[PDB]
Amino acid sequence: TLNGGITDMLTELANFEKNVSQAIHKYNAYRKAASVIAKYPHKIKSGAEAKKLPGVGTKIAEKIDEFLATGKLRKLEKIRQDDTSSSINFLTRVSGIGPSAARKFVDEGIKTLEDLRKNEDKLNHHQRIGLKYFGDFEKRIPREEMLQMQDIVLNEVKKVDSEYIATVCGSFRRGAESSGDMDVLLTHPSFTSESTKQPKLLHQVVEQLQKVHFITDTLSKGETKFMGVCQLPSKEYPHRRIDIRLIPKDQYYCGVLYFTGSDIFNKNMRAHALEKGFTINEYTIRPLGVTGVAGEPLPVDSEKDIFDYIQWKYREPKDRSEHHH
DNA sequence: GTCGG
DNA sequence: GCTGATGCGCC
DNA sequence: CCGACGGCGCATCAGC
């Protein structure tokens, strides 16, 4: 792991800023720094060298220098000693508990998994499912299991209506040998950007997946997005997070670009669009006017067309992952 | 925390 | 009810 | 207090 110490240091600062400081822009600055340094194909020797990379300024340069000399960072040492900061950071790793709820719980004397399990009545439904499956959701999914999960979802969606098309996106579509969860992009002809012909399009698929006891629990559910829990039939497999996103059929290419990721790739791509005078979301690419307001959607017949508009060399899903050297 | 302006 | 903001999450 | 930083779904509350 080339520059592993520096990238792990910056990831740890990132998590502190998001979870304790609630500084989401400092979080994203530390992650940018970590991603660019992790992609750099040379061992960094000084802070002055790293400063040449985009997202590495004076401050990050000065703690690369410190880390390289001492193999540690006083700031991070002091943060780890802070049992309050440690407990907040930990509680946010539970789904439904974010920086705000985590701080409220720690200030009311909930510092550990045991304390959390005793105070189950303080938790809403989401937080309760997040706690119940905390251990399971920490495990990654082997690709062999993702293929099992893909077979079940495709088959049940087909049985509801053959006109449905389900695409497993996220790290799976980027060709990862393990994934954190299963992300399913769903389309149907009856749902487009300008018309809803059929109601309950996402609900019908979730109900079928619940009927065959694949989906076991619901975190959140609306008209276009489902967030819940699934499990493979035993031959017990761990419980897995599943996201299902229903996208307008005429906006599939913008939808699949978003849901394929990575999260850092999307952020960088959408940031470059703004430089070139475009705004990208999961539905459309729109030009920004003189005002800075979004005009009419531009025509998209492929993922590559979106790249072409912002003058980016097309990257295959495999090349949209984060990498190390 | 970086960086454009 | 709608709009806006906060807090949770997705890539 | 230079101020933007990717963009948005779902859940809930505040103000109208």
Ligand SMILES: *CC[C@H](OP(*)(=O)O)[C@H](O)COP(=O)(O)O
């Ligand atoms: C990394 C050091 C900090 O950079 P940022 O603009 O989050 C500060 O320069 C020092 O942190 P403080 O000593 O806690 O103010």
Ligand SMILES: [Mn+2]
């Ligand atoms: Mn490796």
Ligand SMILES: [Mn+2]
């Ligand atoms: Mn590289």
Ligand SMILES: [Mn+2]
């Ligand atoms: Mn620089």
Ligand SMILES: [Mn+2]
């Ligand atoms: Mn959490």
Ligand SMILES: [Mn+2]
């Ligand atoms: Mn207490």
Ligand SMILES: [Mn+2]
């Ligand atoms: Mn209680």
Ligand SMILES: [Mn+2]
């Ligand atoms: Mn995923």
Ligand SMILES: [Mn+2]
């Ligand atoms: Mn997911």
Ligand SMILES: [Mn+2]
């Ligand atoms: Mn650029």
Ligand SMILES: [Mn+2]
């Ligand atoms: Mn993710």
Ligand SMILES: [Mn+2]
């Ligand atoms: Mn500022």
